[PDB]
Design a binder for this molecule. Structure first.
Ligand SMILES: O=P(O)(O)O[C@H]1[C@@H](OP(=O)(O)O)[C@H](OP(=O)(O)O)[C@@H](OP(=O)(O)OP(=O)(O)O)[C@H](OP(=O)(O)O)[C@H]1OP(=O)(O)O
Ligand SMILES: O=P(O)(O)O[C@H]1[C@@H](OP(=O)(O)O)[C@H](OP(=O)(O)O)[C@@H](OP(=O)(O)OP(=O)(O)O)[C@H](OP(=O)(O)O)[C@H]1OP(=O)(O)O
Ligand SMILES: O=P(O)(O)O[C@H]1[C@@H](OP(=O)(O)O)[C@H](OP(=O)(O)O)[C@@H](OP(=O)(O)OP(=O)(O)O)[C@H](OP(=O)(O)O)[C@H]1OP(=O)(O)O
Ligand SMILES: O=P(O)(O)O[C@H]1[C@@H](OP(=O)(O)O)[C@H](OP(=O)(O)O)[C@@H](OP(=O)(O)OP(=O)(O)O)[C@H](OP(=O)(O)O)[C@H]1OP(=O)(O)O
Ligand SMILES: O=P(O)(O)O[C@H]1[C@@H](OP(=O)(O)O)[C@H](OP(=O)(O)O)[C@@H](OP(=O)(O)OP(=O)(O)O)[C@H](OP(=O)(O)O)[C@H]1OP(=O)(O)O
Lengths: 368, 363, 361, 369
């Protein structure tokens, strides 16, 4: 029934159990991390075991014959004690009670909460053409044992520790108002005659995998012909911590072969689905995980909370529909000119919503 | 059918024959001046005949300022050494003209400018100036022990041109990006300009690609693209000229929160300019074969001042923006992209000769 | 004997007269620009003449075989009409009398949220391009149709690049010494470094007495004491460029042996004159000009985003101690201070001059 | 005075002589194995004598009795005939000509060459804490006699064979990599201020026994104190054939006595010498020979040649400088992690360069305790 994710320390003294790999941010609040640590009471005798939740922005990558540039900023750190027991985590959950019963009396609960001022899982490995380096926001759940002298020696032995890279996934809020169409229009005067472009989306928020119906209305009062209409989903990424890196990548494209001749108008609805699967080249785009992993998608739209400096988000991700019109010259070779406009939208995961049966699995994510 | 250019001295004692009026500079090397002098053996008896190549910068309309940039002289009569032609053109001319025909070869060095001159307009401060190239054949004689003489009547001068042709190399594809944030606006106006290549030829069309990204709440009302010629006199007087030698005004406007990409084609030509004063030419205004001056090409470790007149070309793109002019700026929204303008690359038996007067055809 | 600065348009239709090249910012308020425009009434018939004050940040430079990157942000724009004619000053009344009835006054004021004249031409070693904050006074004539065609003809316009110079405020409290101390534990024994300046604000050309107190309780020797004035420049608009340059240095030959203490006062004078290489340093004008100095300390006003200053300039005293081993180690510390021009001052005869600033070599 | 290494077969019929125990790999090419076999012509009558060079990766214990206790992958095998003599039979090298003269007319030369795609002598005996078993790359020079029986079965007796475990030792090329450098910075939770660490080595290649000057620049703009600066030489071992075993061990450590207080910077050069002698515990570390032997050192850096699959190297060995900063009021307050950076470098042996007089010795390597 309920799949539980487990990882064990090298020295087999500390084992951590989580209900999920991915924890839901739905704007209003964030799903807290409720898990249990199974200690070997022999191997933790006279020792203290803690669990920490760390959110960190990182920037840099390994390059041969290049100077190693690394940068880390911790955006959140919290730590509770699981052993010896003290009820650090306060009130308990059903998942914990059920796991304690199944695992035995050496099982201790932890609850680490997320605040409201953190970004969601975003990371980016650049392409050859791209100027800056690998960067991302990681979320680490680390259970580790300290000795009674190790607090004075500032030592946390590696073999007694276990770390899990969880994801903070952006879901839509549960109460949302009815959604107005995302629609703009432009009037491109050419020889004092207008070329009018109206672009309309069904709504403002789309879900990963959901088709985006882009309605394009070209009214051509000019003496020129609209030769081509290209519609893109562009992902715009702004690294806002160590280096002001900028990425703009097409994650979906449809190119109609419609012409709009002089003194005529054309309305057309193209459907685009921005998906990581569409992109052979998975570098230079904001993902919510590593390229190698299967459960990795396009990064959701950053949602900056009121009175929160955007820089503490580390990487800003936004999506837009771009419409390019190729317009004929009167007589030339590249006299053909292009006009383009953008319509912003947000992309995220859908809204969120006994005695359990537990199947235990290694936390490690499946590859491709 | 090879056209040969001839000029004859007043006293008919010395006649000079050149293959060309215009000699090719293609950066790597410069085409030397290979010609022949036909003497009247009666009228040069006991006389010596020389041919000189002089490059001089002049400034003024009496005679105001001269700087000699190069001088070389050879002897044609009496004959020097083997006296056999060094080129096919000479061998062929000697055969056609007879045994009173003597070859000369005057070479150009690599540190000289090309034919540039400038006659100013009423609006312009500063005077006429230019770099001239003179081929002069003249006879010397002595009636005294105490002095040799050089009569004007025994001399013949030709004003040849050193014409700039393209090298094998081209510079990287020229590109500019400019952006403006006007007073009280959080939003940029981005202008990107691109040319197909770095070197264009006289008469060749220049495709200027302009990318206006307008994130402002203002409208780009006009996009004007110019070829500007920039002239810097660098010897007697620090005179500066900047003139439009081509202009195209796109019909498209760029409304708020939109972007426009557009390719305008310009051809910088002397023919476009009714007013031919205040611009760097490669010859006199009156002459038909006169064009816009080619881009100066300063060689490494050569002081730019020995070029006399520096000529450069650039594409200027001016954006006219609504509701700033007089309101959020007293200035102009523009960027420049440099390029070089010159003549095409060079192309790398017994001839039939038609002889013509060297004098260039007028308008 | 008041020296007046004049410049005339190409078409000789508009001539502008200013009292100063340099206008004083003393934190509390900024000295406004009071001048006059002399029109040729024949050449401005049916035309309107305006004067604008523009403050702009610029970034970029011309480079052969390199992509031309240019960037401008206007930080302030204001415009008044001088012709046809629409409180005055003594300088204006006096200039009108001397020049005639075709002379019209203008007053353009500065707000409190602008930086002062700062610019920077980089060195070979430096990444990043030329940038600066310029102040333009431009007098120009428009035609009666030119307001509808959005056109300002160049030949009818005249521009002056004035400076906004940072002076200290006129009422200032008594100044606490700028002092910090550090304890560098070495084998659990402290090496204590105290650095102290006489005051917090120094003037360009004023000597800075740096008092350095080394207390060495370690078993190591302080072999060398170097004291620097470092200029720190942060470009904060187009590109996050960073410069740190020594504009003054004194290297004592003092040793502080184990279990001893040494107090020493070095005097440094941060000056552009000390620097042969004048590139990679924040100046208040062009390198070529004579009246150009080191840029004054940026003074960010409360609740003003530092980014609208364009270039941030700060000064600090750096103390480097070379400490022996048994290879040697270097410890260093910084003490911030502010550098600016002194406090301002609690029928005329006019000599007219071209606005163009005097050069060096 | 050239020391020659000799081993003799149990039956005294075949004796092998080598100039060296250790043969030089300097990237560009590898020093070939030039030796001679002395046969007893009575005891090899109607017999053929060969010499083989085998490079093999092994994992587990050495095969006992009949049981296969080892995983074996052969990376190179070559064999030549010494007896009866092949062709001209004259020496190809000065060492051979000289040995033939000194030993007599029953002395026959052999030359076995190394290719460019092999690893160098690497082996590893694990510690109690370590998962995974003993493994290594061995180089065997084996001289052995074959004879034919009355049924058409040829025989290779153990008693007629002699095997020598030579080493392929990594010496430096002509090229060196660029001066290695790292920069790291941290902004801790609730701190607006960076802690900057810059690390620099003098060069990219160091020799065994050569001191490594590690220059560390700590710029501390934080309100916290750097309480400790520890600098390590870490050896990283990756077994890449039978089992994906990973080892990372400190082979040298220096702890600076300086602390870096708030709003200060410290530049400091610590000298480390990564040596097997520093390590009492010699298990869990990549060596170039057996622990018991005296001439055994730390394994040199693996040098993977272009377009050669790294798996045919068997064991990958790399070295790095690690700098750990211990920062006040962090551990269990603003981090459950470590403040550290790594700078890679390569560790190997130095660059290479009448009748001579021979002293003969047993090939067996000298032990310790
Ligand atoms: O800092 P390092 O590189 O020296 O290593 C850590 C620790 O590694 P870790 O941090 O990954 O857990 C070592 O264990 P391992 O890497 O072999 O597992 C431990 O060695 P140990 O107990 O003798 O173990 P064995 O001899 O039985 O192998 C060492 O102790 P010291 O050097 O003697 O103080 C520790 O140093 P510190 O920071 O002072 O606590
Ligand atoms: O360094 P890391 O975080 O990037 O990941 C490394 C490795 O770290 P180390 O070898 O530098 O010590 C991880 O080991 P521990 O952190 O558990 O100690 C290991 O497990 P993991 O973190 O659970 O798995 P992930 O979801 O992170 O992939 C991971 O597994 P593999 O994907 O199957 O190879 C490796 O991936 P890679 O780097 O792509 O080779
Ligand atoms: O001073 P210059 O160089 O400008 O030339 C003068 C004149 O110079 P002089 O004063 O020494 O006599 C030339 O006579 P010569 O001394 O060379 O024999 C003459 O012939 P040219 O050189 O073949 O012809 P171009 O190609 O130079 O025009 C030229 O053309 P004509 O008008 O058709 O007579 C004149 O032009 P200008 O006065 O501008 O009209
Ligand atoms: O294209 P260019 O660069 O050669 O410009 C010409 C002129 O074009 P033209 O040669 O086709 O007639 C421009 O007018 P348009 O192209 O808009 O018609 C005019 O600009 P403007 O102020 O907006 O307009 P006006 O009110 O003065 O007409 C410009 O004046 P400046 O740059 O201010 O000095 C002129 O310069 P110059 O040659 O010195 O007199
Ligand atoms: O944009 P700029 O500040 O670089 O100025 C340009 C030029 O402006 P334009 O070409 O845009 O019209 C100025 O001309 P006008 O103001 O008289 O119209 C000129 O004099 P200037 O600034 O008054 O003189 P000073 O203050 O320096 O004495 C200045 O000469 P330089 O003395 O060598 O600097 C030029 O500099 P450049 O080309 O870099 O050498």
């Amino acid at each position: 029934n309920h799949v539980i994710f487990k990882k064990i320390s090298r020295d087999k003294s500390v084992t951590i159990y989580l209900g999920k790999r991915d924890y839901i941010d739905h704007v209003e609040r964030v799903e807290p991390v409720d898990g249990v640590v199974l200690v070997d009471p022999e191997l933790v005798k006279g020792k203290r075991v803690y669990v920490s939740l760390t959110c960190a922005f990182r920037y840099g990558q390994e390059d041969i014959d290049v100077m190693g540039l690394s940068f880390r900023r911790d955006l959140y750190f919290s730590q509770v004690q699981v052993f010896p027991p003290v009820g650090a985590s306060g009130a308990t959950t059903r998942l914990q009670e059920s796991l304690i019963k199944k695992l035995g009396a050496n099982t201790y609960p932890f609850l680490l909460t997320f605040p409201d001022y953190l970004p969601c899982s975003v990371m980016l490995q650049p392409a050859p053409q791209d100027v800056g380096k690998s960067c991302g926001v990681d979320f680490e759940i680390k259970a580790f044992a300290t000795h009674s002298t190790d607090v004075e020696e500032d030592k946390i032995p590696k073999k007694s520790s276990v770390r899990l890279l969880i994801r903070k996934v952006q879901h839509a809020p549960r109460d949302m108002g009815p959604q107005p169409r995302a629609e703009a229009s432009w009037q491109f005067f050419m020889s004092d005659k207008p070329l009018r472009l109206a672009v309309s989306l069904s709504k403002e928020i789309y879900y990963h995998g959901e088709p985006i119906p882009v309605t394009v209305a070209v009214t051509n009062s000019t003496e020129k012909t609209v030769k081509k209409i290209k519609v893109l989903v562009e992902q715009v990424t702004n690294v806002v911590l160590y280096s002001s890196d900028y990425y703009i990548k097409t994650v979906a494209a449809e190119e109609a072969q419609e012409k709009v001749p002089p003194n005529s108008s054309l309305t057309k609805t193209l459907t685009l689905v921005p998906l990581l699967a569409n992109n052979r080249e998975r570098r230079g785009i904001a993902l919510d995980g590593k390229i190698k992993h299967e459960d990795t998608n396009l990064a959701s739209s950053t949602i900056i909370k009121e009175g929160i400096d955007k820089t503490v988000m580390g990487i800003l991700v936004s999506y837009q529909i771009k419409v390019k019109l190729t317009v004929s010259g009167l007589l030339g070779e590249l006299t053909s000119s292009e006009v383009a406009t953008e319509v912003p939208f947000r992309l995220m995961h859908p809204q969120p919503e006994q005695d359990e049966n537990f199947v235990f699995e290694e936390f490690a994510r499946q590859n491709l």
